[PDB]
Enzyme design. Structure first.
Site, PDB file in Angstrom:
ATOM      1  N   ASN A  99      -2.780  -9.109 -16.825  1.00 13.94           N
ATOM      2  CA  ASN A  99      -2.415  -7.705 -16.607  1.00 13.94           C
ATOM      3  C   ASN A  99      -2.380  -7.323 -15.112  1.00 13.94           C
ATOM      4  OD1 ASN A  99      -3.453  -4.520 -16.471  1.00 13.94           O
ATOM      5  ND2 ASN A  99      -1.982  -4.945 -18.108  1.00 13.94           N
ATOM      6  N   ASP A 130       1.074  -3.856   9.614  1.00 12.64           N
ATOM      7  CA  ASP A 130       0.662  -4.569   8.415  1.00 12.64           C
ATOM      8  C   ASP A 130       1.864  -4.999   7.552  1.00 12.64           C
ATOM      9  OD1 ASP A 130       1.212  -2.390   6.764  1.00 12.64           O
ATOM     10  OD2 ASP A 130      -0.827  -1.912   6.305  1.00 12.64           O
ATOM     11  N   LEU A 188      -6.488   0.100   8.785  1.00 12.77           N
ATOM     12  CA  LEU A 188      -5.292   0.923   8.889  1.00 12.77           C
ATOM     13  C   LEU A 188      -5.474   2.059   9.891  1.00 12.77           C
ATOM     14  CD1 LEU A 188      -2.497   1.811   7.880  1.00 12.77           C
ATOM     15  CD2 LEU A 188      -3.710   3.258   6.323  1.00 12.77           C
ATOM     16  N   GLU A 209      -7.478 -10.708   5.601  1.00  7.80           N
ATOM     17  CA  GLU A 209      -6.905  -9.777   6.540  1.00  7.80           C
ATOM     18  C   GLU A 209      -6.629 -10.347   7.924  1.00  7.80           C
ATOM     19  OE1 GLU A 209      -6.008  -7.013   5.787  1.00  7.80           O
ATOM     20  OE2 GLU A 209      -6.934  -6.551   3.847  1.00  7.80           O
ATOM     21  N   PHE A 211     -10.644  -2.184  -0.635  1.00  9.12           N
ATOM     22  CA  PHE A 211     -10.455  -2.237   0.793  1.00  9.12           C
ATOM     23  C   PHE A 211      -8.968  -2.253   1.127  1.00  9.12           C
ATOM     24  CE2 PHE A 211     -12.200  -3.526   5.005  1.00  9.12           C
ATOM     25  CZ  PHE A 211     -11.082  -4.070   5.631  1.00  9.12           C
ATOM     26  N   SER A 223      -6.320  -2.888 -16.705  1.00 10.11           N
ATOM     27  CA  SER A 223      -6.996  -4.056 -16.174  1.00 10.11           C
ATOM     28  C   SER A 223      -8.488  -3.751 -16.077  1.00 10.11           C
ATOM     29  CB  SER A 223      -6.555  -4.401 -14.766  1.00 10.11           C
ATOM     30  OG  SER A 223      -5.164  -4.511 -14.656  1.00 10.11           O
TER      31      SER A 223
END
Ligand SMILES: [Cl-]
Ligand SMILES: [Cl-]
Length: 162
Positions: free
Chosen positions: A132, A20, A32, A11, A104, A117
């Site tokens: 996948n 972002d 965010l 990040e 996250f 998955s």
């Protein structure tokens, strides 16, 4: 390596409001702020989150505090989620970090939608789950970060981050 250092690499850290990869108003370590187009709605959310008038700028400590809360919320969201919890419980410590990372970034709802998955991870079919996982908007939009997370799931080591 640990979840904190992992996410800090993925990040980055920014002390001023930024947009972002999707174009949303963010601050610190991938925190965010709002999906609204308004920089003012973003500054307001920011001040609310920090408990002071920030004028869109925070210090390192403030960023780290947001980060601590966010990782904690991510883990707790996984544990409260009926779809996620069983997956998390079944995993080793490194792979648990990989799921926390996805949560996250994309929220509990988003990850919980990777039904197939998830089932492959639970069954420990590593190579199949990696293949996948790659067929997703996620991988297409942030391919470098996605590959790192995927490699973590395939291998069970921190190689991609070293
Ligand atoms: Cl908050
Ligand atoms: Cl990327």
């Amino acid at each position: 390596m640990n979840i904190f250092e992992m996410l800090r690499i993925d990040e980055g850290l920014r002390l001023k409001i930024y947009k972002d990869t999707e174009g949303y108003y963010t601050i610190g370590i991938g925190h965010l702020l709002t999906k609204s187009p308004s920089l003012n709605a973003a500054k307001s959310e920011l001040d609310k989150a920090i408990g002071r008038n920030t004028n869109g700028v925070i210090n390192k400590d403030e960023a780290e505090k947001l980060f601590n809360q966010d990782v904690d919320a991510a883990v707790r969201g996984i544990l409260r989620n009926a779809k996620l919890k069983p997956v998390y419980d079944s995993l080793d410590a490194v792979r648990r970090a990989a799921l926390i990372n996805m949560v996250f970034q994309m929220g509990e709802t988003g990850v919980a939608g990777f039904t197939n998955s998830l089932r492959m991870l639970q069954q420990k079919r590593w190579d199949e789950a990696a293949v996948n996982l790659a067929k997703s908007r996620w991988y297409n939009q942030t391919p470098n970060r996605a590959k790192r997370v995927i490699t973590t799931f395939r291998t069970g080591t921190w190689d991609a981050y070293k």
